[PDB]
Symmetry: C2
Subunit: 341 residues, 2 copies
């Protein structure tokens, strides 16, 4: 009883070029060069749930699934959703679905999209009469709290929404495997306070992940850190491929996080020895890191541009602070009508 | 019991020291009118502890009491409704590192004040979706401090507490059985807790001091007071009746009702004068000394009832929870035995 992907979609605001960022002083020459980012999607006034809802409408329309058959709505994100004590998943449900199933947030930092997929799968499988689930992501990474170029140097953060419709009934792709790996010993890498003590008091101040990474490594050790990160990634990869009865050579396209060149090279290209041309590198480098929606955006790009053929397998690769890793193997069954040739 | 029965195997809270209404009056946080309308006696307030800390502390109590091995914890879910202290950081992973020490998936679930029950819904699904799974840990934690939040006036009529709660859910066994759990959603009401047009897109970000009363008035003006009240009422009724019917029970069959830790005025309008039940049959006295624990009230309330021996074997408990959105969850829980951590 494998599940299906029935629809997917994105809403991306207009790109800002690396050239404009250089001219505005947001990016410097070394950072442009190390990341090799071409542009990043940047929202003027659209808010995260707004962008999530626009993406959901597209994904639902494409899926053909009726509102009455959406049994769950999960909205994932990693940054402030705009209003405290307010329900962004309810906005998404109101705007994009119009139905009355449960709607809630799921977060797992940059692995939020896949985390929601894990829980949505369980939800659909937990009762015989359930049909589809809507997963969305949305984030808006603006000043003063965040610097999309320098809060986490090496990765350039985008504004935008993504959505996927998961179904037990049918769809244009089959979810062949989905595996999540957890190394919570690394949780201290993304906060202040002692890595093996309680979190430091809250600031305030703009997000600065580099400062926390340096402190974590100083305490835990560089060798320990790198090895444990590599191990988690390896476990998710191998876990997902084995569960689908596949090897990396059987994968036609790999959906990777939208990190800069140097990070992807270290984590993936020079590690697994896969070619960048077989991945979503070119798409990601124009888009930026979409909170927890990268693997949805990248899969959506691959399918919509006809780069994936019936019977071909796609590997989704996602990671977030925590750390958590998810990999999934998806088999494309048919080219959907919204796709290009 | 039967296969697919779910049980509460453990629970616990971590509550920081109470600040009395008197202290709040003296300090200017509260005026005598709010004190009188809410009838609050005290609220749990943390000095230095952060939300995941309090969650992990509560989780340690709940896991120890449950006697469930870390290897048998198949999922960790952490619910909350306010800033967790560090952006792009994983509070659920902190809870996992500190309180569980294992490698199952750990994530956050949020549904505002209904978060604990939303996490319970997904925990239940996760456990039932695979034959081999055993237990799941659910935690809540929140720290409602200035300058971002005013626990007495950010949402007048409810006084917010700092603290953590936790519950261990199991397919294997426990001291209580989950007889039903039902969640209701009325998303037409989402605009009530935000700026922007209630039926248009949200207004730009507001990290600033939270002020719900302002957004609520705006909603009612556009949507209509009559519409607003009726839809809130209907959602609450659907969750209640759905949970009772699913359990084979009527309200008369319920020994204790776990209510949100709201102020007396809000509880009277939504529950006491509507359902015609007595405060003594609810967690009113506990809540009025505790305050609104983010999405964790029904866990703290159930924990209180079991821990103080108020609930007896064979008796049924009704959990009542609600959050902005709006979302409602009700659950019927049957106490099977008095656990060893309880008194009589």
């Amino acid at each position: 009883g494998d599940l299906y992907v029935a629809g997917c979609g994105v809403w991306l605001p207009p790109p800002v070029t690396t050239e404009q960022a250089l001219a505005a002083g947001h990016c410097d020459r070394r950072l442009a060069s190390s990341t090799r980012m071409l542009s990043v999607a940047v929202a003027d006034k659209e808010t995260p749930a707004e962008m999530a809802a626009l993406a959901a409408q597209t994904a639902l329309d494409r899926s053909g699934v009726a509102p009455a058959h959406v049994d769950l709505v999960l909205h994932a994100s990693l940054y402030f959703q705009g209003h405290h004590l307010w329900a962004p998943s309810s906005y998404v449900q109101r705007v994009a679905v119009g139905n009355r199933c449960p709607a809630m947030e799921v977060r797992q930092v940059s692995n939020g999209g896949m985390a929601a997929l894990e829980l949505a799968r369980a939800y659909l499988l937990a009762a015989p009469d359930r049909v589809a689930a809507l997963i969305t992501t949305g984030d808006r990474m603006h000043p003063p709290g965040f610097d999309r170029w320098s809060s986490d140097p090496g990765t350039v953060y985008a504004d935008g929404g993504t959505a996927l419709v998961l179904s037990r009934q049918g769809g244009f792709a089959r979810l062949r495997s989905l595996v999540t790996v957890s190394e919570p010993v690394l949780e201290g890498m993304h906060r202040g306070g002692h890595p093996f003590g309680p979190p430091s008091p809250e600031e305030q101040r703009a997000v600065d992940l580099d400062a926390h990474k340096r402190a974590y490594v100083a305490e835990a050790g560089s060798s320990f850190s790198v090895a444990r990160v590599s191990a988690g990634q390896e476990e998710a990869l191998t876990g997902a491929l084995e569960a689908a009865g596949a090897g990396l050579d059987d994968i036609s396209r790999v959906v990777l996080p939208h990190m800069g060149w140097r990070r992807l090279s270290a984590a993936y290209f020079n590690k697994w020895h896969i070619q960048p041309e077989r991945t979503t590198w070119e798409f990601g480098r124009r888009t930026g890191h979409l909170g927890g929606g990268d693997p949805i955006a990248g899969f959506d790009h691959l399918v919509g541009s006809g780069r994936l053929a019936p019977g071909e397998l796609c590997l989704l690769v996602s990671v977030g602070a925590g750390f958590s890793w998810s990999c999934a193997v998806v088999e494309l069954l048919e080219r959907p009508s919204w796709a290009a040739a």
